[PDB]
Amino acid sequence: ASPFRLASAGEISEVQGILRTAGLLGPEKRIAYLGVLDPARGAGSEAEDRRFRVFIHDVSGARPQEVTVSVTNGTVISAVELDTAATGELPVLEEEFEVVEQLLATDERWLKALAARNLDVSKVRVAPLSAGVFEYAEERGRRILRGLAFVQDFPEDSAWAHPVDGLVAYVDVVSKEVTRVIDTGVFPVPAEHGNYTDPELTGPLRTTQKPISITQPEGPSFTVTGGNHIEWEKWSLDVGFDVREGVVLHNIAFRDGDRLRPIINRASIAEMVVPYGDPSPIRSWQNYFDTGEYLVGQYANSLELGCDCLGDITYLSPVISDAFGNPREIRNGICMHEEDWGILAKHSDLWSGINYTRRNRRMVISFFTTIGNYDYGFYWYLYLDGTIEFEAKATGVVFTSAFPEGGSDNISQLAPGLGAPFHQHIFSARLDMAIDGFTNRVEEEDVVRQTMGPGNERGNAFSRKRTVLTRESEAVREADARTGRTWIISNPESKNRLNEPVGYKLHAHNQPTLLADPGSSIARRAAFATKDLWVTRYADDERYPTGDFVNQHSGGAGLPSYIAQDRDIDGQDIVVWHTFGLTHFPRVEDWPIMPVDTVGFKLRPEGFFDRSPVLDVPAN
Amino acid sequence: ASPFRLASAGEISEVQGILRTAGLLGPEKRIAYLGVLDPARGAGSEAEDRRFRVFIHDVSGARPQEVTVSVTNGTVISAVELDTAATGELPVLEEEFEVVEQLLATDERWLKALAARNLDVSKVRVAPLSAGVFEYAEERGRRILRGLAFVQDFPEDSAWAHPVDGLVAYVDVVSKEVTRVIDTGVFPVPAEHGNYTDPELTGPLRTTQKPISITQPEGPSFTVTGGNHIEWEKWSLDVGFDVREGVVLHNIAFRDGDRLRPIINRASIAEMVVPYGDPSPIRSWQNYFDTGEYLVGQYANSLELGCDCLGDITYLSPVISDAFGNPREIRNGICMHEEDWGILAKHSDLWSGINYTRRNRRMVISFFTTIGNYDYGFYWYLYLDGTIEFEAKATGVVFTSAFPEGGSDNISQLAPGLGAPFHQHIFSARLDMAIDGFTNRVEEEDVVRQTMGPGNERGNAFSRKRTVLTRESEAVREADARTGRTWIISNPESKNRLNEPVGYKLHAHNQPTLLADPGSSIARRAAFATKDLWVTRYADDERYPTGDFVNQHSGGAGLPSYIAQDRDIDGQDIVVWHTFGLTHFPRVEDWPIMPVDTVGFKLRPEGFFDRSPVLDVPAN
């Protein structure tokens, strides 16, 4: 009955039938994106209308289309032809991954470059990399991928250990033309293998690890109803799944006595970008938006009990569309479980004689995605004390190059002749806030140092200041770790028992933002990544910080266009966009497969409750 | 046999006998500190000599003494009389906690102040707070404590809910004189109770939490030999305990193939300070050094299985001295266990078809201490991949005041009439480094942004720079989150297979350092806390960042005095001192007992290994 339920196989099959009957899904068509639309604001009309948004690619060169369909009524709501030179290309199709390698294998320039290196074409894998927008006028309005080559010595070899540097090609995947092959010189192909399951490399496996057994003999503390509605330790929320964003959290609320109090209306990772800092023309164009260009949800892993998720696990298996509109289940794509989280509160009092200890726990909602060499785990955490936390776990295989003789200021050496270019991993969290309702505002809070003098004669005082962000043009903010800068989202019309507005405080990790020159192509296309915090006024069509069509879009779409409207955000329906990321100088220990590194953010209640919300937790 | 073994009851009883026979432990004497000395550098002589350092207080006014004794030989090595006006007072004695309240209860000025407030003297608890050094010339060379009052309505009442503001007293605990009583005006005593075990405040306890069972059916993966030597998943270390510092880690090393490779010679939290930012004369002197003034190890809790430590726990029960030289066991004062820590590494490869997942785990060594209203957990973590992490968990009850009518820039309101002054919690980690041996150096690493132009035509390049710290005068460093600043400790004489110096990278949380005016008394006494990182040349007697006698010391001791020697630290035996802390603006949710908040730091290998060190972890 819930409008926030996961898409079903039957819904997707109906979408397929509707599109087919409307003449929109002929043999030349491919679905590049399909997802359910959220209910519009003011859905208190009980009018169930399940709508789906579809991007339809055409492999014959005809214009792609954006289509909205109602599965409830069986109708096409709207269908628009896209001019991709203007608004951007559609996301990369899984079936195009192989097309780049296949087209290059018959190109005489490519074969000549491989022949000079004595590389057998049958052993050469080509990574299908997004193109961006640079100096090549012939690419405007064409669907381009760029290819970088890696050697596989045998079918189970890790090709990443064998980059073919000095060589890059550009391909038009619709007309099936290789537009350019650039060969800047012969680099030795690094010869050491990177096969992390080869006993020669691992040595004998440890026999010293004894099992850790995590069980719940009475089952878990959370309940799941209607497929995707979670209730856990006063929390309530709906777990959604979208092929672009992955796991999406809806209607996060906390039951405080008799009242269900909303906190966040929608939480998602709405974009991520990996920019490379190597100035070599072989890679200086390389910036991939895993979310906006490739769609991280379609590459979600099936998670194995005992390996990926340990404990008493409840799974969800989301359904997505394939390129022809058939429903495809991602079996066990989402893990949900609770975890012990150490001490919650503790005090032994010298005067009352009372000794008190309580344990903490968290609810975990997670999925793992794989796009080429990189793998990421996305983790949402809910804690007993009202804290909400997100954490990204980055692992997989670092993207490699040759390591030049005489060194490099922009590449680290991992193995003889093997390099790893510097890069960043930058995420955008989109938090459609609803602190006790939709009337919200953001304050920036800084520590204030005070000078010794009158009223502060011993020079010990310090304070803080809060600055209300009142319009979008002043709501683009940067971090300041040295002044302890945080941001508070509050509801000025909802007060705690001390007559102060209820609020939540956002704690950032204060990692560096986008390092590229502000005049660069990537700074224009990933403008969101140049600042730590953006606040916009909610609007139905403002979904992604980069715009709807990221692939080969020339720049400026998304957040910089939204905030130009300079809307009132002081006590309004607002959305917080938080940029956070890792800056990766690869280390030898990252090779041949990288141990997890993490980054994230958290929100803690700030006068939201009238006292500690975990006084009613029992003593274990 | 190990020189790093925990002190035994028999050793402490021998110390007592030696001191007694030497005439040093008469009825007027109290042991204020007793601890075992670490072996001197170059202990490869196998000459076992267990030495103990003792601070001896005299309750009759005679000069205190510092004494070093050899329990192996049964001799006093040295005994020095202390001039406390010059070098500082001895740490606070547990038995002085009650003396402040008892002395005030017979002082006519104190009784007059309580009578005006209609407070029964039998219900008034007095916190025994360290005095610091301010404007009062009569305090120099006297042992002073300052008292702040709290009402207990009944024996099990939380007195912290009932601060008596506007009133402070100073007491000489040796001459037993109340030197000053300051009454700045009547504030209402806040009336709401803060009894977090009262059903009226908690409401009915949750019945929704189902058990989480963590067991190890084959026992834990670590071994303990010689009482305190740990081996776990290639890690080796000794767990020490000192009454001032608490848990101390010695000889941290990692078995890399056939070689035991040292990493850290000694790791400890060598000081912590809690400065208050309230300019009221009632509290503007308030700064307590829990480690240096009160000794956090003597207040370690006995940790309960299933409540404080969950899982298959191995306990240590350290032995300390009481004030008369009798050994006292802290039963179950240290928890040790391993914990699952999620995914270690994961990759599903599109070209090789290999799907690979490994799980992480960490070894946990922890203790919990309670000093008055505050409780802290100290956690050391060792991870499979070579990471070392420290985390402090702060909980307990916030220190309270009245909340003034008309508000405050330096106090937050927690309940009607009840305030909580702003403050910080700042720690100093002392890391006596031994990266592959004692020839170490520190580099500061900053991200380097590059301008678009020749050699960087697309404006994407970024780099990093490393600055070697060569002498102590240039080794006082501050954080810079915006440039991704970290510090690398390396061994220039020990190289990995790529011919690069092996190293470890220190990752700070980049929280604000000491906020007080640089001209203040606390900035002089806690100078370590004004900067994020200090590097000194190792010396036997340079143990604490604040000096040996912190209580009522006038300032400048410790790190600022050490670095004035301007010693060579480029490829030498060096010690890293890292300042890190929390800045606490108390929130309503911190009351009446505070949920845990955390802060810490970590060190990750940086080309220490020749590849990932966890390739030999099995597949679970």
Ligand SMILES: O=CCc1ccccc1
């Ligand atoms: O993460 C997207 C870039 C990519 C895609 C496929 C193979 C290698 C790299």
Ligand SMILES: O=CCc1ccccc1
């Ligand atoms: O943490 C040391 C300060 C303190 C000591 C005893 C009671 C309250 C506060």
Ligand SMILES: [Cu+2]
């Ligand atoms: Cu990376």
Ligand SMILES: [Cu+2]
């Ligand atoms: Cu605090």
Ligand code: NA
């Ligand atoms: Na355009």
Ligand code: NA
């Ligand atoms: Na909103």
Ligand code: NA
């Ligand atoms: Na002095």
Ligand code: NA
């Ligand atoms: Na050292």
